[PDB]
Amino acid sequence: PRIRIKTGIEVLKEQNFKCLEGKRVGLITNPTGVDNHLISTIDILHEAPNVNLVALYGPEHGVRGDVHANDSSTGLPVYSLYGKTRKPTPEMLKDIDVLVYDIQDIGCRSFTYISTMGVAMEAAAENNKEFIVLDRPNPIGGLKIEGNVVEDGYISFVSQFKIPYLYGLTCGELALMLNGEQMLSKPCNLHVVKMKGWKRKMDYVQTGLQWIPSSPHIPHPHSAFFYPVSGILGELGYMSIGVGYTIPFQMFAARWVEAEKLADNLNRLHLPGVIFRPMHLKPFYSVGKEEHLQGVQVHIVDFNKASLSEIQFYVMQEVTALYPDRAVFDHADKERFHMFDLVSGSKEIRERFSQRNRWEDVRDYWYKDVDDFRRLSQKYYLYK
Numbered sequence: 001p002r003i004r005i006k007t008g009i010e011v012l013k014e015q016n017f018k019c020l021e022g023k024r025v026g027l028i029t030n031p032t033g034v035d036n037h038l039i040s041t042i043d044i045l046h047e048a049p050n051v052n053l054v055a056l057y058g059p060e061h062g063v064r065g066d067v068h069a070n071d072s073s074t075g076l077p078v079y080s081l082y083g084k085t086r087k088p089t090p091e092m093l094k095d096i097d098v099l100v101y102d103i104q105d106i107g108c109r110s111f112t113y114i115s116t117m118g119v120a121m122e123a124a125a126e127n128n129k130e131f132i133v134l135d136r137p138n139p140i141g142g143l144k145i146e147g148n149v150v151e152d153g154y155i156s157f158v159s160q161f162k163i164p165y166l167y168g169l170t171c172g173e174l175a176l177m178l179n180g181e182q183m184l185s186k187p188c189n190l191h192v193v194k195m196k197g198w199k200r201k202m203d204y205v206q207t208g209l210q211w212i213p214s215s216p217h218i219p220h221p222h223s224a225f226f227y228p229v230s231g232i233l234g235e236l237g238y239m240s241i242g243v244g245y246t247i248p249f250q251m252f253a254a255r256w257v258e259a260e261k262l263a264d265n266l267n268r269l270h271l272p273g274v275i276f277r278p279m280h281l282k283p284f285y286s287v288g289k290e291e292h293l294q295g296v297q298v299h300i301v302d303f304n305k306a307s308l309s310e311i312q313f314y315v316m317q318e319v320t321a322l323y324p325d326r327a328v329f330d331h332a333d334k335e336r337f338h339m340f341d342l343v344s345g346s347k348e349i350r351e352r353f354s355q356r357n358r359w360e361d362v363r364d365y366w367y368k369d370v371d372d373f374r375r376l377s378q379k380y381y382l383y384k
């Protein structure tokens, strides 16, 4: 048992917080912003005598994770970066010189912490404030790139930048790209505190760090791999994807499915690195609460070989072939289709899939931007 890397916060401590000296510091963080001893970056900067920590900013789900105003332990003002104020206002920034960002994300575009980062960067740029990212590992590694980039009509808080669905960058590398490619409204005075020892091949468990639930339904490091497996279909609340049960994002089920038939049809696809297992369950809450459901558990037996985000579409395809009168876009809540399109970064994914419920009619669109994005990413990589 050993921590094999130095996170941005560990590097900042080793540098005795030099890049923060003489500045009024604002800190964007949540319960994942901790050092190797699981002490919060809030308490580290508050206790450092050469750091003037003056304000805290909490993203989706909150800062001490207790809201989901002033901080009890430090007495510092706490600002909410969600809903109407997802982007810091000029009034929220008048009391600081630099915004420090320290949050563990999951390497998926629809997870809104990276949206908070980019929009806070843009607010910093527009108000002449410095922005510092304390870099953290990409928990699914720095090699997988999947999905089309976001189209203009589908840019939103759950699809904030023209990057793929799995974008393969650390939050620090993404910040550098947003700045370098003029993807935000104005250039930002950005500094990234680079990690030591992190490698693109590393998944989170290989770093040796503890995983703090990124959000309630991403409780374990392996859960970050499964969020893109089922998360897009999950926006509809049509089938259970395990949210409401004890393996969130790792399964697909409904009351009208025959588990063994669905598993047999999916295993016949021979998707690399995946095995589907039939299952029977009764959700405790959310979708299918207290109903007997049947479906499949998705077991990833080789994380390097598996193409993650396409799995929900193969499941939708095979479920529909078995139960043709249960097609997702024929029976799911129509009021959730716009959200599905936003998370997908285009209405083309739903529209092409809806023609005959076949992934082959969407696959080329899903893969079209990978080679161009990998080439663009090489300009900003910090780690080998």
Ligand SMILES: [K+]
Residues within 6 Å of the ligand: 045, 046, 047, 048, 049, 050, 051, 052, 053
């Ligand atoms: K301090």
